[PDB]
Amino acid sequence: RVPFSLLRDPFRDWYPHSRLFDQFGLPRLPEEWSQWLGGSSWPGYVRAPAYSRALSRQLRHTADRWRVSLDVNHFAPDELTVKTKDGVVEITGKHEERQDEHGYISRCFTRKYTLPPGVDPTQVSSSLSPEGTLTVEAPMPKQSNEITIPVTFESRAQLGETAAK
Amino acid sequence: MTERRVPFSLLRGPSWDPFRDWYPHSRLFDQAFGLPRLPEEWSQWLGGSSWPGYVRPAYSRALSRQLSSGDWRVSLDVNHFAPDELTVKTKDGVVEITGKHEERQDEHGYISRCFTRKYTLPPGVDPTQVSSSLSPEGTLTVEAPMPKQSNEITIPVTFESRAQLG
Amino acid sequence: TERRVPFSLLRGPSWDPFRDWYPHSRLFDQAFGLPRLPEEWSQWLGGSSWPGYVRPAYSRALSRQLSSGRWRVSLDVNHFAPDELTVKTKDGVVEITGKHEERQDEHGYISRCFTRKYTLPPGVDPTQVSSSLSPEGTLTVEAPMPKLQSNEITIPVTFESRAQLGGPEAAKSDETAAK
Amino acid sequence: MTERRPFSLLRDPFRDWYPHSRLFDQAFGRLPEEWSQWLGGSSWPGYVRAPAYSRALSRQLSSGRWRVSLDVNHFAPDELTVKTKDGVVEITGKHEERQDEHGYISRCFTRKYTLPPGVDPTQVSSSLSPEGTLTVEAPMPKQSNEITIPVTFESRAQLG
Amino acid sequence: FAPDELTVKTKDGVVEITGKHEERQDEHGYISRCFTRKYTLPPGVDPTQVSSSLSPEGTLTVEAPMPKQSNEITIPVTFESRAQLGETAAK
């Protein structure tokens, strides 16, 4: 799993297709110099600087985003707590009448979204629409062995590599 | 002048083959090779015997990240702990960070260690807006882009009911 | 006449260092090396690979397109998009048959088949007719013209008998030449 | 490419001059943006266009082979019709005694040839010797999944 | 497609629609595509009920009254008399 369309586009929108990696050192090749990108890549250094920039356009050119919808209007919650644990977005919301002596009708809901592995929680935002529709949206990085994948500090370069699922 | 720089310092002087980034294993690169449709092979390589060393998750966070030094943000030294699993939970405006190690049978053998570090958030934060990050160099760092309100933390009426929310 | 060290032809195409015709393994697993039991399976995918070699419709994916348009005829096949093309030469008639299908979508199970018939110029050997398919989708059928010679075709006596099948004379159907 | 497989023919076209990678360099063209070093381990798409580099491959033999034999002399056919269908060369000979009333002694033969898949039928020629021996010969292009292999427009480069 | 003729035949409870497009050129009347769509009928649909419709914009609509699978194999009955002839459901 690699978004290869997004890792190959980032070198291919100019006159040549490898010159973007070539341009931050000059062209002196027997000093270990990437030629091929498919067949020869090397470690991404990629440091008015901006090669690792406008690479994602104004967000190769893609603003991947996980997004989910929740119709809550009928529920009309007094409070919605949304917790992220072990790569699962858990949305707990409570509705109850405030009656001291005897409060009846106390309804709550807890919805567990299975995140696509890779999504860092700092990208996950919740927005409640005027119509009463909860929208949980997150920028996608851009399912490994170690279990703990979420990283990315608003920094999408080299942190992915996961596909749609 | 100030030239003669040629920043070819990122070739990985990690000894075992020209890579060894995070766990010098093959199954590591087997995840970053191509598409997953069974009659599509296994990348079948290992370090030297391969197409070039590509740094294409936490491999760019080996060099530049380190600790990040750090917008809310908190730093946590994890390298010495060296956890097999890290669980980060945000509940009732409290970030709870739980690390775990695990079993290898030897002279030491059956020794477990687990740490729980609790951070009290500023009362603005969407509890889905908090995350951690693990480097190979080993310093966990937790940032949070806080929405705008939520006094008790449990009140998200914004985007439309901004009157009573902010 | 200068500015002659360009680049490109490198197939941007969005997927890996190619997407010449579909991003499949068994596509490139055919042309990698030598066919033994475990003489590897190649194991690239692109971004992770040896070169971006174009070594059979991938060479016709760029330079061909139409074959540009010897007996030679062009056939627009792109809209058809056939999975199989059978070209048959029988009794001096080149018959081009194509078949589609292989997916269950909104249309689904429509089975479409087209039969385009070409009448050969007299003298063309029935073994001498070919077809070629590009990814851009234009089929082109040529045949080397003999000596530009039978009437009914089906008279292959030429390698000894030059008398009745040979040079140019007009008399009472004894021997044709350039038509 | 003969049932199961030609790299000796793709790795000769670069090796008969002073250096062994330089033949890709001279058919082409700044040399660091994206250039060919190795050809085995690193090759790039073949563009390769006196255009002597595409013409050196054939060694001026084609100017710019599969072969089979058939002893037909005993048969003595009035007509031999050779038909290539679905990547199988089928040779049908017919013999008859022109008789209106009674045309007995009518013999026919049908020989089906396997073919190495890749052989384009435009390359397939039939020749009948004076001694009465049919020879069906074809230039080899230089088996895949798509079923329809035959292409070649008398252009051997990258097909086979 | 733009067919000169669309011939629709119903055989063994399968509607087979064969369209043909051909040029009218005696020497060489090339450029002639054909298509054969085979519809699996829901068993019980009698072929008197099956109507063919060709729209001005070129969309063929094959419509049929449902009777309201069987062992005997010959299921098509109805005479435009649908009482007690069915029993098959939607599938």
mmCIF file of C-alpha atoms in Angstrom, chain A:
data_model
loop_
_atom_site.group_PDB
_atom_site.id
_atom_site.type_symbol
_atom_site.label_atom_id
_atom_site.label_comp_id
_atom_site.label_asym_id
_atom_site.label_seq_id
_atom_site.Cartn_x
_atom_site.Cartn_y
_atom_site.Cartn_z
ATOM 1 C CA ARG A 1 0.000 0.000 0.000
ATOM 2 C CA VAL A 2 1.488 3.280 -1.246
ATOM 3 C CA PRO A 3 -0.159 6.338 -2.798
ATOM 4 C CA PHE A 4 2.324 6.040 -5.705
ATOM 5 C CA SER A 5 0.366 8.456 -7.880
ATOM 6 C CA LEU A 6 1.157 11.024 -5.148
ATOM 7 C CA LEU A 7 4.841 9.943 -4.711
ATOM 8 C CA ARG A 8 6.254 9.460 -8.256
ATOM 9 C CA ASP A 9 3.135 13.543 -9.751
ATOM 10 C CA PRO A 10 5.528 15.322 -7.271
ATOM 11 C CA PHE A 11 8.461 14.970 -9.667
ATOM 12 C CA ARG A 12 6.544 14.884 -12.988
ATOM 13 C CA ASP A 13 4.773 18.230 -13.672
ATOM 14 C CA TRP A 14 7.894 20.029 -15.080
ATOM 15 C CA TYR A 15 10.043 19.629 -18.253
ATOM 16 C CA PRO A 16 11.779 16.455 -17.015
ATOM 17 C CA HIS A 17 10.295 13.936 -14.511
ATOM 18 C CA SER A 18 13.360 13.497 -12.164
ATOM 19 C CA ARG A 19 14.773 17.066 -12.203
ATOM 20 C CA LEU A 20 12.480 18.024 -9.293
ATOM 21 C CA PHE A 21 14.470 15.745 -6.954
ATOM 22 C CA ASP A 22 17.646 16.956 -8.720
ATOM 23 C CA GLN A 23 16.869 20.548 -7.651
ATOM 24 C CA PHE A 24 18.990 20.887 -2.681
ATOM 25 C CA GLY A 25 22.276 20.137 -4.434
ATOM 26 C CA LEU A 26 23.842 20.678 -7.851
ATOM 27 C CA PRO A 27 24.344 18.072 -10.603
ATOM 28 C CA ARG A 28 27.564 16.231 -9.668
ATOM 29 C CA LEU A 29 26.497 12.605 -10.086
ATOM 30 C CA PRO A 30 29.201 10.175 -8.784
ATOM 31 C CA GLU A 31 28.554 11.661 -5.312
ATOM 32 C CA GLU A 32 25.480 9.419 -4.826
ATOM 33 C CA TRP A 33 22.807 11.094 -6.982
ATOM 34 C CA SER A 34 19.197 9.905 -7.556
ATOM 35 C CA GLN A 35 18.547 8.920 -11.189
ATOM 36 C CA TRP A 36 15.212 7.118 -12.055
ATOM 37 C CA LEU A 37 12.974 7.781 -8.979
ATOM 38 C CA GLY A 38 11.186 4.496 -9.743
ATOM 39 C CA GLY A 39 14.482 2.631 -10.213
ATOM 40 C CA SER A 40 16.524 5.004 -7.992
ATOM 41 C CA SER A 41 14.997 7.129 -5.214
ATOM 42 C CA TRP A 42 17.296 7.513 -2.143
ATOM 43 C CA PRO A 43 16.161 9.154 1.156
ATOM 44 C CA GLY A 44 13.827 12.130 0.766
ATOM 45 C CA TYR A 45 15.636 15.209 2.068
ATOM 46 C CA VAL A 46 13.377 17.662 0.176
ATOM 47 C CA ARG A 47 14.408 20.838 2.103
ATOM 48 C CA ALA A 48 12.146 30.964 -1.094
ATOM 49 C CA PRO A 49 12.072 27.244 -0.162
ATOM 50 C CA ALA A 50 9.053 25.120 -1.119
ATOM 51 C CA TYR A 51 9.583 21.739 -2.814
ATOM 52 C CA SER A 52 7.859 19.929 0.016
ATOM 53 C CA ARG A 53 5.310 22.733 -0.439
ATOM 54 C CA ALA A 54 2.596 23.561 -2.938
ATOM 55 C CA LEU A 55 3.406 19.926 -3.644
ATOM 56 C CA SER A 56 0.055 19.205 -2.176
ATOM 57 C CA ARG A 57 -1.082 22.146 -4.347
ATOM 58 C CA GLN A 58 -3.024 24.532 -2.072
ATOM 59 C CA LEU A 59 -4.010 22.295 0.809
ATOM 60 C CA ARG A 60 0.888 15.211 -5.790
ATOM 61 C CA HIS A 61 -1.901 17.804 -6.024
ATOM 62 C CA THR A 62 -4.593 16.285 -3.789
ATOM 63 C CA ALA A 63 -6.274 17.155 -0.485
ATOM 64 C CA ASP A 64 -7.223 13.671 0.715
ATOM 65 C CA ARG A 65 -9.748 13.731 3.545
ATOM 66 C CA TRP A 66 -11.652 11.186 5.603
ATOM 67 C CA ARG A 67 -15.168 12.496 6.203
ATOM 68 C CA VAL A 68 -18.285 11.051 7.874
ATOM 69 C CA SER A 69 -21.865 12.256 8.478
ATOM 70 C CA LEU A 70 -24.232 11.746 11.437
ATOM 71 C CA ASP A 71 -27.904 12.841 11.485
ATOM 72 C CA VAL A 72 -28.465 14.094 15.066
ATOM 73 C CA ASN A 73 -31.345 16.611 14.549
ATOM 74 C CA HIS A 74 -34.011 14.237 15.883
ATOM 75 C CA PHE A 75 -31.856 13.433 18.931
ATOM 76 C CA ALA A 76 -31.311 17.110 19.867
ATOM 77 C CA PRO A 77 -28.439 16.462 22.291
ATOM 78 C CA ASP A 78 -27.627 18.713 25.232
ATOM 79 C CA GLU A 79 -23.999 17.539 25.024
ATOM 80 C CA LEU A 80 -21.755 15.560 22.581
ATOM 81 C CA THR A 81 -18.436 14.056 23.782
ATOM 82 C CA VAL A 82 -16.225 12.711 20.986
ATOM 83 C CA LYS A 83 -13.271 10.535 22.072
ATOM 84 C CA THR A 84 -10.537 8.935 19.892
ATOM 85 C CA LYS A 85 -8.903 5.749 21.241
ATOM 86 C CA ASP A 86 -6.828 3.010 19.520
ATOM 87 C CA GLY A 87 -7.681 4.451 16.075
ATOM 88 C CA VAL A 88 -11.455 4.369 16.678
ATOM 89 C CA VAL A 89 -13.522 7.598 16.819
ATOM 90 C CA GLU A 90 -16.100 7.126 19.587
ATOM 91 C CA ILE A 91 -18.941 9.726 19.635
ATOM 92 C CA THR A 92 -20.929 9.745 22.908
ATOM 93 C CA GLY A 93 -23.833 12.248 23.169
ATOM 94 C CA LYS A 94 -26.381 12.698 25.944
ATOM 95 C CA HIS A 95 -29.934 14.031 26.052
ATOM 96 C CA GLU A 96 -31.767 14.317 29.364
ATOM 97 C CA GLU A 97 -34.349 16.558 30.980
ATOM 98 C CA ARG A 98 -33.111 18.554 33.946
ATOM 99 C CA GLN A 99 -35.586 17.612 36.658
ATOM 100 C CA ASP A 100 -34.271 17.454 40.234
ATOM 101 C CA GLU A 101 -36.881 15.263 41.908
ATOM 102 C CA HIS A 102 -37.424 12.892 39.010
ATOM 103 C CA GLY A 103 -35.822 13.239 35.581
ATOM 104 C CA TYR A 104 -37.217 10.734 33.085
ATOM 105 C CA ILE A 105 -36.211 10.295 29.409
ATOM 106 C CA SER A 106 -32.411 10.275 29.569
ATOM 107 C CA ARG A 107 -31.219 9.119 26.126
ATOM 108 C CA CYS A 108 -27.594 8.703 24.981
ATOM 109 C CA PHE A 109 -25.781 7.435 21.846
ATOM 110 C CA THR A 110 -22.209 6.146 21.287
ATOM 111 C CA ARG A 111 -21.099 5.723 17.621
ATOM 112 C CA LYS A 112 -17.747 4.003 16.924
ATOM 113 C CA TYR A 113 -16.084 4.831 13.581
ATOM 114 C CA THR A 114 -13.378 2.446 12.390
ATOM 115 C CA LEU A 115 -10.691 4.836 11.088
ATOM 116 C CA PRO A 116 -8.591 3.930 8.051
ATOM 117 C CA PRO A 117 -5.197 3.193 9.646
ATOM 118 C CA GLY A 118 -2.838 6.183 9.358
ATOM 119 C CA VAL A 119 -5.203 9.036 10.261
ATOM 120 C CA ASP A 120 -3.671 11.185 13.005
ATOM 121 C CA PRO A 121 -6.280 12.390 15.535
ATOM 122 C CA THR A 122 -5.061 16.041 15.321
ATOM 123 C CA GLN A 123 -6.549 16.202 11.847
ATOM 124 C CA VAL A 124 -9.964 14.896 13.055
ATOM 125 C CA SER A 125 -12.434 17.795 13.554
ATOM 126 C CA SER A 126 -16.140 17.779 14.446
ATOM 127 C CA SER A 127 -18.618 20.363 13.110
ATOM 128 C CA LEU A 128 -22.364 20.425 13.825
ATOM 129 C CA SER A 129 -24.354 21.794 10.886
ATOM 130 C CA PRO A 130 -27.307 24.234 11.212
ATOM 131 C CA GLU A 131 -29.688 21.495 10.100
ATOM 132 C CA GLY A 132 -28.394 19.342 13.000
ATOM 133 C CA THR A 133 -26.001 17.019 11.168
ATOM 134 C CA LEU A 134 -22.705 16.156 12.870
ATOM 135 C CA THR A 135 -19.807 16.097 10.378
ATOM 136 C CA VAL A 136 -16.530 14.518 11.564
ATOM 137 C CA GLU A 137 -13.810 15.373 9.015
ATOM 138 C CA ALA A 138 -10.057 14.680 8.980
ATOM 139 C CA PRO A 139 -7.145 15.301 6.631
ATOM 140 C CA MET A 140 -5.788 11.917 5.530
ATOM 141 C CA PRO A 141 -2.027 11.511 6.013
ATOM 142 C CA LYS A 142 -1.458 11.977 2.274
ATOM 143 C CA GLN A 143 -1.921 -0.578 8.884
ATOM 144 C CA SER A 144 1.745 -1.316 9.744
ATOM 145 C CA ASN A 145 3.123 -3.949 12.165
ATOM 146 C CA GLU A 146 3.874 -1.776 15.243
ATOM 147 C CA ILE A 147 0.103 -1.109 15.912
ATOM 148 C CA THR A 148 0.600 2.596 16.822
ATOM 149 C CA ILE A 149 0.407 4.530 13.534
ATOM 150 C CA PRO A 150 -0.975 8.028 14.182
ATOM 151 C CA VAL A 151 1.794 10.621 13.892
ATOM 152 C CA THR A 152 1.830 13.639 11.543
ATOM 153 C CA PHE A 153 2.233 17.187 12.946
ATOM 154 C CA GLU A 154 0.285 18.916 10.145
ATOM 155 C CA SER A 155 3.244 17.495 8.132
ATOM 156 C CA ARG A 156 2.020 15.184 5.367
ATOM 157 C CA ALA A 157 5.321 14.570 3.564
ATOM 158 C CA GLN A 158 6.469 10.910 3.972
ATOM 159 C CA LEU A 159 3.642 9.997 6.414
ATOM 160 C CA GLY A 160 0.904 8.155 4.554
ATOM 161 C CA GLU A 161 1.895 4.692 3.634
ATOM 162 C CA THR A 162 -1.773 3.639 3.544
ATOM 163 C CA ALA A 163 -4.277 3.711 0.677
ATOM 164 C CA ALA A 164 -8.120 4.153 0.780
ATOM 165 C CA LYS A 165 -8.351 1.152 3.137
#
